[PDB]
């Protein structure tokens, strides 16, 4: 609590608000706060990178919108808006006791929302979408909370519907979720787990531009093609242009088809994933075709597996640092069933039996593998598919908390439950 004395001098017209870090009251001002009037120190910017787009299970921000900290916050009443403001921030920049007054105000609006842009010593910046944009480094400005609508999703090589699961967990309203898949077991998992909502098409190679058009505008296109013929450690690999490697290009096609024309500035997002263990010309050619370079993200940071993956795309802040929320299970032990004990601290999949159970050397249980990969327990307990099949399905999938990290800022562009 270091800024209380500084703000007095700020309102006494003895210090510029723009000359202080309105987050922590540091004098080491380097940047301007992207959302509000004031300076920002570097450490707070780092914090802002990790924290801004962290949301709790209530679908509200985990921490204060200003300081990216705060001990007790006020949630925002307005529809589809998810922001919070700690009592403390408010009890300075707005005015004293303004916070508890907002606590007591049953229909309450947050300052990113409220009609006027000035609210005490605190006033909202007009170019803030662009500053927000640059802070995290064709770009779309965040849509006002009232205007937001349910997201429309094209999901190719959908697997066990990780995409939809994460979107649900973030409490993003989903208008529709068309998904291409060919594996019966995976289709099944999806059907059961999301209660028929997924519109399944078949093979990606049956999806035409006409189809793309009549399956109605998409707001988000995502996917990760098979990696087997891309993977460099596979002796039999056929590479990007043969085998299943070329399925990449189907993504490249459909993305193109689903993409808005220039002059249509509606928000649009896409995400393609694949293994980092690929060839060099392969990785370059993917980058050429998607006209971008991948970010590399490893699950280990936030899950209990060594899982290093490339992610090409235009999701906001996908360069930003990965944070581990308390919910996450680092360490294989957190993921094991009782009476079982973890050899390593992380599982490794892109001795052979990672578990000790009563002197004998056992493999991971599907429920344990689920726990490793961030999936809710039993998520792939659905049909009568073999243990082999259930294992393979979990083998291919995205790490749930990594995808949660990637999808989270979509909340600032679409509607909430």
């Amino acid at each position: 609590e270091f800024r209380e004395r500084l703000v007095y001098e700020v309102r006494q017209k003895c210090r510029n608000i723009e000359d202080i870090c309105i987050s922590c009251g540091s004098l080491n001002v380097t940047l301007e706060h992207p959302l509000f009037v004031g300076g920002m120190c570097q450490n707070c910017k780092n914090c802002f990178l990790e924290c801004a787009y962290q949301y709790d299970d209530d679908g509200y921000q985990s921490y204060c919108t200003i300081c990216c900290g705060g001990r007790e916050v006020l949630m925002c009443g307005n529809n589809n808006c998810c922001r919070c403001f700690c009592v403390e921030c408010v009890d300075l920049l707005v005015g004293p006791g303004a916070a508890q007054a907002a606590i007591k105000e049953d229909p309450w609006n947050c300052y990113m929302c409220g009609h006027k842009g000035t609210y005490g010593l605190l006033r909202r910046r007009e170019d803030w979408p662009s500053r927000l944009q640059m802070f995290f480094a064709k770009v779309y400005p965040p849509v006002p909370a009232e205007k937001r609508k349910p997201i429309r999703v094209l999901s190719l090589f959908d697997g066990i519907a990780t995409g939809l699961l994460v979107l649900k967990d973030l409490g993003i309203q989903v208008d529709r979720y068309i998904a291409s898949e060919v594996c019966e077991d995976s289709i099944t998992v999806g059907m059961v787990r999301h209660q028929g909502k997924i519109m399944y098409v078949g093979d990606v190679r049956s999806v035409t531009q006409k189809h793309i058009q009549e399956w109605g505008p998409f707001d988000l296109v995502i996917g990760g093609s098979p990696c087997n013929d891309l993977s460099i450690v596979n002796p039999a690999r056929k590479g990007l242009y043969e085998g299943t490697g070329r399925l990449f290009f189907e993504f490249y096609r459909l993305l193109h088809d689903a993409r808005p024309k220039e002059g249509d500035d509606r928000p649009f997002f896409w995400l393609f994933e694949n293994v980092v263990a690929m060839g060099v010309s392969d990785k370059r050619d993917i980058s050429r075709f998607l006209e971008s370079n991948p970010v590399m993200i490893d699950a280990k940071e936030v899950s209990a597996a060594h899982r290093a993956r490339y992610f090409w795309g235009n999701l906001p802040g996908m360069n930003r640092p990965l944070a581990s929320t308390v919910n996450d299970k680092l360490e294989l032990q957190e993921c094991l069933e009782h009476g079982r004990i973890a050899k390593f601290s992380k599982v490794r999949t892109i001795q052979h039996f990672p578990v000790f159970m009563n002197e004998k050397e056992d493999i991971l249980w599907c429920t344990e593998m689920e726990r490793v990969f961030g999936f809710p327990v039993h998520y792939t307990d659905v049909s009568n598919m073999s243990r082999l099949a259930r294992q393979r399905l979990l083998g291919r999938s995205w790490s749930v908390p990594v995808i949660r990290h990637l999808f989270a800022p979509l909340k600032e562009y679409f509607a909430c439950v």
Binding site: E72, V73, L74, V326
Partner: peptide, 10 residues
Amino acid sequence: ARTKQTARKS
């Protein structure tokens, strides 16, 4: 309006 308490950080 509504109020919650934050989760302490790593």
